């Protein structure tokens, strides 16, 4: 129903290179006045969305001429002729011809660099925390690229699911890597029931998945 | 100044309802529609619906029907959105933006964060994450609300530091880690202290982290 299929989801680029983002509508979004109300917005971290292009091809006042847009009918493209540091963020196409209005799913424009494997570290729960009845086991993935990485927790060789949470930093301003932290949460009684605590990490930079582990009570 | 002034952060318990306000300034309120947008990591931007201040006419994205109620107050030049029966899926940043017919969303509010959680204000507990290159850190656990600040060695140690986005646990309390990589050689000599500040609870704690 006038859904916008926006691709790709993430677009790694080098500064100075060209970037192209595409948005495809399930049916024609030409409005009955002959115009197509297809807009492009940019949202940078910590900021409101910002208008770039309206009526498919028109630059909003103040937008650099590096930005252009094109298409007709069901197919639309935003082009950045040369990407600059201030362009990084998430781009959204927006269909304003027919209610309900709809956004594309977003394209995260990011810095491309070479593959870098994570350095992996595992932390047992502190004795201080075990005094309070909970055990948190933490697995750190440091300075890796690209973003996709997978953490698998295992307790006495049994794979865990549903008991962990993780988060990932924003792309580092110096080296353009990411870091990831994962926490396995267990009750103290469960933690004292088992010996071997391990996190196995899969990443394109590793020849095979890497496991870091400790034995409870050294 | 042409602006849309949005109300402050909402920390709300599940099942309650909340009123968000969007105050128009520096232009004629009834010459523009007011549109509301929801922003989340998982769904990106979503169009909630809109109101025509001149007529009170509204239209909704059907996904938000029954969740959102839009009104517009001519005399105060303020648009409102009630969000009803809140769940964790309603946690988000909500924007209002204006639209003149056939133009575009040129001016946006700065967004209202809505945080749905059963918790109340609580200061964190800070636990050490103990170790060529070594990693060490602090686990900042069971606080509410965001944010907390973390520094290392009173802010002198910035190199190799990663402080992660907090995660919201099922208790409704946040948990956050901060780590630093340092030479393994230094672990006997040099001292490492994470400095944690949670202003809503006036919690300030330094934790020394040792092997």
């Amino acid at each position: 129903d006038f859904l916008m299929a926006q691709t790709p989801l993430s677009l790694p680029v080098s500064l100075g290179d060209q970037a192209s983002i595409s948005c495809r509508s399930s049916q024609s979004i030409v409005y009955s006045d002959g115009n197509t109300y297809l807009e492009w917005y940019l949202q940078r971290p910590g900021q409101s969305p910002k208008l770039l292009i309206y009526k498919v091809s028109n630059r909003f006042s103040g937008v650099p001429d590096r930005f252009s847009g094109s298409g007709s009918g069901t197919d639309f493209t935003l082009r950045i002729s040369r990407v600059e540091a201030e362009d990084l963020g998430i781009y959204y196409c927006f269909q304003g011809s027919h209610v309900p209005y709809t956004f594309g799913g977003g394209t995260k424009l990011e810095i491309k660099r070479t593959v870098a494997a994570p350095s992996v570290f595992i932390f047992p729960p502190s004795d201080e925390q075990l005094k309070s009845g909970t055990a948190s086991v933490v697995c750190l993935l440091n300075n890796f690229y690209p973003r996709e990485a997978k953490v698998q927790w295992k307790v006495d060789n049994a794979l865990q699911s549903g008991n962990s949470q993780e988060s990932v930093t924003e792309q580092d301003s110096k080296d353009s890597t990411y870091s990831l932290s994962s926490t396995l949460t267990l009750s103290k009684a469960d933690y004292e029931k088992h010996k071997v605590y391990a996190c196995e990490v899969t990443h394109q930079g590793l020849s095979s998945p890497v496991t870091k582990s400790f034995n409870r009570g050294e | 100044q042409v602006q849309l002034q949005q109300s402050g952060t909402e920390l709300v318990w599940p099942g309650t309802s909340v009123t968000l306000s969007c105050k128009a300034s520096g232009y004629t309120f009834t010459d523009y529609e007011i549109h509301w947008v929801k922003q989340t990591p998982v769904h990106g931007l979503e169009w909630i619906g809109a109101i025509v201040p001149k007529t009170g006419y509204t239209a909704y994205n059907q996904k938000f029907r029954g969740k959102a109620i839009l009104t517009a107050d001519k005399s105060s030049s303020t648009a409102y959105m009630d969000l009803r029966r809140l769940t964790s899926e309603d946690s988000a940043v909500y924007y209002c933006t204006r639209l003149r017919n056939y133009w575009y969303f040129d001016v946006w509010g700065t967004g209202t964060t809505v945080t749905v959680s059963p918790a109340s204000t609580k200061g964190p507990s800070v636990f050490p994450l103990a170790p060529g290159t070594a990693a060490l850190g602090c686990l900042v656990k069971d606080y509410f609300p965001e944010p907390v600040t973390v520094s290392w060695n009173s802010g002198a140690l910035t190199s190799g530091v990663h402080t992660f986005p907090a995660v919201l646990q099922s208790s409704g309390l946040y948990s956050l880690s901060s780590v630093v990589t340092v030479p393994s050689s230094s672990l006997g000599t040099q001292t490492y202290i994470c400095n944690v500040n949670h202003k809503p609870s006036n919690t300030k704690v330094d934790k020394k982290v040792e092997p």
């Binding site: 409005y31 006045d33 109300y37 807009e39 927006f94 304003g96 011809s97 027919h98 209610v99 209005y101 | 529609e33 549109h35 809109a50 025509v52 001149k54 007529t55 006419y57 509204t58 239209a59 639209l99 003149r100 017919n101 056939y102 575009y104 969303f105």
Partner: peptide, 8 residues
Amino acid sequence: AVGIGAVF
């Protein structure tokens, strides 16, 4: 966008 209250 067109707007929800535009008519013609």
